[PDB]
Amino acid sequence: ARGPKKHLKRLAAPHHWLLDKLSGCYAPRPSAGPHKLRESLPLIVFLRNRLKYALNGREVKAILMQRHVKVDGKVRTDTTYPAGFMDVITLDATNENFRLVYDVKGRFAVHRITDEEASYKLGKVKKVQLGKKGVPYVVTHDGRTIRYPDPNIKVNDTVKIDLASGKITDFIKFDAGKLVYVTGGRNLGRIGTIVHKERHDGGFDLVHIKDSLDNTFVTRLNNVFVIGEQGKPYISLPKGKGIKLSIAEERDRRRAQQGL
Amino acid sequence: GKGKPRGLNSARKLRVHRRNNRWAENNYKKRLLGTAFKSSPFGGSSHAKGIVLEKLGIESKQPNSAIRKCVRVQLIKNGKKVTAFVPNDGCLNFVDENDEVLLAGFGRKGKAKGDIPGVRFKVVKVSGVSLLALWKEKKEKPRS
Amino acid sequence: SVGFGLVYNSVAEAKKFEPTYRLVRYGLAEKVEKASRQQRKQKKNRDKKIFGTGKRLAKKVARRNAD
Amino acid sequence: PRAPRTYSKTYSTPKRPYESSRLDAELKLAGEFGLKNKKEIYRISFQLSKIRRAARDLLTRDEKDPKRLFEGNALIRRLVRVGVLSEDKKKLDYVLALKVEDFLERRLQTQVYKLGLAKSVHHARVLITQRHIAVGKQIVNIPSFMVRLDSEKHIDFAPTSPFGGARPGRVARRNAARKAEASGE
Amino acid sequence: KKDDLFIKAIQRVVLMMGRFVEPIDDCPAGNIIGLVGIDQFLLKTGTLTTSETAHNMKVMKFSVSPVVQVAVEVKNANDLPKLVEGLKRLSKSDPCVLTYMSESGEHIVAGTGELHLEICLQDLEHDHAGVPLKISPPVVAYRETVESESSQTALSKSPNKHNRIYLKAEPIDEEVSLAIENGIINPRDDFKARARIMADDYGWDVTDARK
Amino acid sequence: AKVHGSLARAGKVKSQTPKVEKTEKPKKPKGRAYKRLLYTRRFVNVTLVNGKRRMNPGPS
RNA sequence: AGGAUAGUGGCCUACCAUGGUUUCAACGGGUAACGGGGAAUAAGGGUUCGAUUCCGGAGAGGGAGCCUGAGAAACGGCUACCACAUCCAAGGAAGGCAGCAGGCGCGCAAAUUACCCAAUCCUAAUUCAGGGAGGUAGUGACAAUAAAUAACGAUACAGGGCCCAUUCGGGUCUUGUAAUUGGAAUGAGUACAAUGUAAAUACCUUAACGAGGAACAAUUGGAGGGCAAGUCUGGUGCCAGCAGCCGCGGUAAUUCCAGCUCCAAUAGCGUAUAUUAAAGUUGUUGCAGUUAAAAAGCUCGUAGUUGAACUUUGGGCCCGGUUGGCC
Numbered sequence A: 001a002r003g004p005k006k007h008l009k010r011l012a013a014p015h016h017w018l019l020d021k022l023s024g025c026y027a028p029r030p031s032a033g034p035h036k037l038r039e040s041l042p043l044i045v046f047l048r049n050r051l052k053y054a055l056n057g058r059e060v061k062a063i064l065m066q067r068h069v070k071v072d073g074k075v076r077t078d079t080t081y082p083a084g085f086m087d088v089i090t091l092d093a094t095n096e097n098f099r100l101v102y103d104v105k106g107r108f109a110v111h112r113i114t115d116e117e118a119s120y121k122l123g124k125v126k127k128v129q130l131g132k133k134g135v136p137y138v139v140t141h142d143g144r145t146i147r148y149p150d151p152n153i154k155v156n157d158t159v160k161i162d163l164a165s166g167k168i169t170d171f172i173k174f175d176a177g178k179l180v181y182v183t184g185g186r187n188l189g190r191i192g193t194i195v196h197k198e199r200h201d202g203g204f205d206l207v208h209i210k211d212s213l214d215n216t217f218v219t220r221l222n223n224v225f226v227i228g229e230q231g232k233p234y235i236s237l238p239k240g241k242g243i244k245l246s247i248a249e250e251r252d253r254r255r256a257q258q259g260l
Numbered sequence B: 001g002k003g004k005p006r007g008l009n010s011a012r013k014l015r016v017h018r019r020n021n022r023w024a025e026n027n028y029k030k031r032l033l034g035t036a037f038k039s040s041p042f043g044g045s046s047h048a049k050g051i052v053l054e055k056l057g058i059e060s061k062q063p064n065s066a067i068r069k070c071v072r073v074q075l076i077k078n079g080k081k082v083t084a085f086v087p088n089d090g091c092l093n094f095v096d097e098n099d100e101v102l103l104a105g106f107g108r109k110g111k112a113k114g115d116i117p118g119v120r121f122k123v124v125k126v127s128g129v130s131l132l133a134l135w136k137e138k139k140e141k142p143r144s
Numbered sequence C: 001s002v003g004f005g006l007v008y009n010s011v012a013e014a015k016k017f018e019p020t021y022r023l024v025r026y027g028l029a030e031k032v033e034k035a036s037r038q039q040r041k042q043k044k045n046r047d048k049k050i051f052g053t054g055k056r057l058a059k060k061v062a063r064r065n066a067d
Numbered sequence D: 001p002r003a004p005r006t007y008s009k010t011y012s013t014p015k016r017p018y019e020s021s022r023l024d025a026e027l028k029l030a031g032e033f034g035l036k037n038k039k040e041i042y043r044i045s046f047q048l049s050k051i052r053r054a055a056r057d058l059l060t061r062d063e064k065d066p067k068r069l070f071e072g073n074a075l076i077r078r079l080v081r082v083g084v085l086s087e088d089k090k091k092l093d094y095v096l097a098l099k100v101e102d103f104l105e106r107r108l109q110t111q112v113y114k115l116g117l118a119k120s121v122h123h124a125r126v127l128i129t130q131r132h133i134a135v136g137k138q139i140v141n142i143p144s145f146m147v148r149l150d151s152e153k154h155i156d157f158a159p160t161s162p163f164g165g166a167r168p169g170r171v172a173r174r175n176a177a178r179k180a181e182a183s184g185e
Numbered sequence E: 001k002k003d004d005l006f007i008k009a010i011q012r013v014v015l016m017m018g019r020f021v022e023p024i025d026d027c028p029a030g031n032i033i034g035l036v037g038i039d040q041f042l043l044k045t046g047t048l049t050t051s052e053t054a055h056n057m058k059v060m061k062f063s064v065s066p067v068v069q070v071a072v073e074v075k076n077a078n079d080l081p082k083l084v085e086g087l088k089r090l091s092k093s094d095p096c097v098l099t100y101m102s103e104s105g106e107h108i109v110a111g112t113g114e115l116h117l118e119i120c121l122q123d124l125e126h127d128h129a130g131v132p133l134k135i136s137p138p139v140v141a142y143r144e145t146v147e148s149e150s151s152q153t154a155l156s157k158s159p160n161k162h163n164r165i166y167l168k169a170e171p172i173d174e175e176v177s178l179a180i181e182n183g184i185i186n187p188r189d190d191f192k193a194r195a196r197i198m199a200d201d202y203g204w205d206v207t208d209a210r211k
Numbered sequence F: 001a002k003v004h005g006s007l008a009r010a011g012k013v014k015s016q017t018p019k020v021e022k023t024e025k026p027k028k029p030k031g032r033a034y035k036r037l038l039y040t041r042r043f044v045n046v047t048l049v050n051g052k053r054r055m056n057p058g059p060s
Numbered sequence G: 001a002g003g004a005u006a007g008u009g010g011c012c013u014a015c016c017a018u019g020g021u022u023u024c025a026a027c028g029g030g031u032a033a034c035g036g037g038g039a040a041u042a043a044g045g046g047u048u049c050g051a052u053u054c055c056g057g058a059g060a061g062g063g064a065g066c067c068u069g070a071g072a073a074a075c076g077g078c079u080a081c082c083a084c085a086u087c088c089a090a091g092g093a094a095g096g097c098a099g100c101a102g103g104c105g106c107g108c109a110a111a112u113u114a115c116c117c118a119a120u121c122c123u124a125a126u127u128c129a130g131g132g133a134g135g136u137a138g139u140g141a142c143a144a145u146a147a148a149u150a151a152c153g154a155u156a157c158a159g160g161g162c163c164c165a166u167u168c169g170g171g172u173c174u175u176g177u178a179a180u181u182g183g184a185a186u187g188a189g190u191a192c193a194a195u196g197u198a199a200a201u202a203c204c205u206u207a208a209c210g211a212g213g214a215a216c217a218a219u220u221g222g223a224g225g226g227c228a229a230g231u232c233u234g235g236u237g238c239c240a241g242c243a244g245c246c247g248c249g250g251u252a253a254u255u256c257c258a259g260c261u262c263c264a265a266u267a268g269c270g271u272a273u274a275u276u277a278a279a280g281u282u283g284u285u286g287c288a289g290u291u292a293a294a295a296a297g298c299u300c301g302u303a304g305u306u307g308a309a310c311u312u313u314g315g316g317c318c319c320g321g322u323u324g325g326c327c
């Protein structure tokens, strides 16, 4: 309709944000950026809903403009900056380091982290090519153009970024038996280990995964994301560690907490 | 048997056969031909205003014997010269010619009810005031 | 009665990061001289017509009102 | 515009509106619990239809149904917290045996008279609504509130009430005080 | 009583400055003002109050009575609604054009003179009902009467040629005719109560009053 | 049939009916209280029990 | 093959050939058609509706053209024609509420020319400005939730209590009671006050006031059947009227008009239109065709629908997921 939309009114936002129907008519539209707005969590919803650090939009806005929040080492005063998957947050006060990762329930876990390993990030090779003058380059899923990758790299591999300089520290090839994080479908947010792989040529490859408690499943290939090897993920995992337990034990997990 | 194709791929015949036999309805034929919208005093409405032009003493049908005190109301929205029944005792003294009255259906989607020949409407209001209220003398019909 | 609470460290900063309606609520600030939303809309509309200061036409119309 | 606010009616109506066998039967209940109308005894029966519909299409399922005990025990927990089903007999057959007097008894104004202070349900709920009943420390003012079996230790006169103390009421004020002018010349 | 007492609110207050208009929130007493949104129930004249004690202000004597009569009708049958609603619309404007029906059923509008009728009718061709109307002179209703006491007793044959009824027609006194219309003698008043009160009031026998 | 029915007869019975006045009677407990008295009049003071409770038993 | 486009392409142009779709419904017509998510109904199967809270499309009176721009064939941009209409000094000029309020109309049918950016978001050079987007309030019996209209004292005793139910002159410690009699209890409302709130009006709270007929007074429909409730009193006399259908009304009307009483749902209840169920009266589930409507006069027959049987069965062994009274 005559151009790109600027208003993303409520009931059209991604459901995993968990916006309140009565709290308003519209929803914060994630501006352009590293992450597509479907899988992105804007700063306003993060800092007002996932943390309650701010009363409302003006207080979130007041925080960003004093440059007190920075994401990935950059201040990003935008209230609706498209923060998405595996996005690190730094706070000068509170000595607080956040990171945006899915929990088992397909929504962004409020997973805190520590300064030492907060300093780095992880991305997944969306494509590998070579630009002008034949300089090879890969693109991480957050649109981090990484020039001069190691030739061992391939597509759909996962690379770790210093985040102080746009440099690859270490990379992981798409090898079987390597822990993968799912970011799409009913398996969204499920951390698990590759069982094997099936090509199914023509598009939309199929991948087989077995959860830590031996909960098998299968998903696409464009929704997977390697995190490392079984027992050594290259980041800390949220409470529940992507186990997708049944629907019964949360009765146990919830009653035991308060109701004993 | 049963005279209908039970074959697994006979869906096309079943739907075509059912779609032709649905025309034998009365309601479905009316809805699909839009006879309310096309040929009906009310353009698919429930109520319609109009002007009382004269009064009709409508002799009832057998076995009854009575004068039904209907009014020849022409509908403002399409000009149709229809006859409207006037319920309740009196209520033909309450209304006169060149009033404005609100008509309603007569309870039977056409097909005049009771012993009233050819009158498929009943007057509800008059001069913008309910004829029911007038009968109970709660309000007074303005001279306007 | 159940509500919400917020305590600021300093009065000087209290006027800074506080919503302005609580400022006049607690008497810290005065409700500024402002007309109703409709009237302050009208004045910008009539100000939208004149292309700049509009004083030149103001002195212009006086001389054409002379004779 | 506005995101729609969900709303759904909580009562059904009999298909046959005028049945001698039915009308008088629920009239006994409305005359056993003083229902202001029979929209109450529908709203319970419609809820009872909605509750027992799930059992109706889940007794079809086996006893190893995750969904069966997923909500069966929890609903009984509501029923035993409220009391409409006692702490024993924790099988959903009993729920299909439950009659609305359960809910009708577990109405407040039903329980309040059972613990007196009212001498009648005629007084029980006017005391409820004349600001003279406290379920806990709070004045719950609706007869069909479905007590969760916990304010039986908290139910009493409203502490703000004259009957709960600290007030004399309007009439006792208007006559005891007016005696002073009325004491003579 | 509870008659003609509309309880509404002034939709908007406008102060008349020539043809111009402008809303006003508050207009104090003793001022010329214009009000909107209340005429649709108002009958072209009335009194506004905010307490119940008040009776109504006196009706205006109209200075000139609505003397002239003209019977208006419609060129086409389908065009009856357009003016009959707007013909009341006219009576709302001028404080003397009375709008009523005749006895044969034609609308009558009463102007205050030969000049007034034409002005209050140009609108009914352009303003209140654009579809043209036809100007007709009023038809005045007549009554037939007899005072000769028909000699030949009237008599007729029922269409079956079997039954027979004899009749005679005599005049009725105007006072008797008047008191019928004025409501002295009514169908509502019972045969026994009606017969006696008039048996002496106007010279008749006992029997005819009972009959 | 005959079509010239007479308009001059309308409202006859309503017009000539013997006028009566609504009796002044005690105001009735209404609502839940009305249901109590209705429950009561159906199960406490059942005046006519002859065979079946006549809810409107004629005076005889 | 070229041109055009951001690119593909009969998208256009030239040349070439006769192709394309169709009884599996093309094409043409109708639509009281914007599509979908959905809504109502709903045993299941379904039916009807879906302008309308979200997504998508189209439009900005009707066509048409175009500038700027990343993004428009834009219309709170422009140009022209057509319709309408506005101001006028008559020469000209200026328009597009299917934005929010409101107004002349149409109709059975639908609210304020209110307040505010406080909140949700959006735009901007952008903390601040703006936003009839939105929100607040007003009107609102659309619809939905909960529940005021009222209790305590005994009124001839017209009830198993009792001295074994006796004399019902004894508290017959409980139920009914003649507009008779007194004591608590308040809300509905009014209102200081906080407050909610951008600001208030309300809720929730509360001073103080506020009930005897508690005149602070519940209605809407019915009482022949369907269908709950009269053969009760008065009037009417095939009239008036009632009656969704049957029917009532002719001087004793359980049906009309009333009054009393009684029903029903109850702050809601009727009526009208449309539709769903009922309707197994549209039928796949699931109708009927001798006579009730319906088997073509009969045969052939293409598309359709349907279409006989037969093709590695069985038997052993092994691994490894179970209930019970040998945990």
Ligand SMILES: CO[C@H]1[C@@H](O)[C@H](O)[C@H](OC[C@@]23C[C@@H]4[C@H](C)CC[C@H]4[C@@]4(C=O)C[C@@H]2C[C@@H](C(C)C)[C@@]34C(=O)O)O[C@@H]1C
Pocket: E069, E098, E100, E101, E102, E103, E108, E138, E139, E140, E141, E142
């Ligand atoms: C208040 O309005 C009143 C008075 O002005 C007055 O009674 C006026 O009298 C006019 C006539 C009145 C006659 C009686 C009402 C019955 C017959 C009527 C008339 C018809 O012939 C006689 C006079 C003159 C007529 C003419 C007008 C056709 C009347 C009429 O109103 O039609 O009528 C209007 C309606």
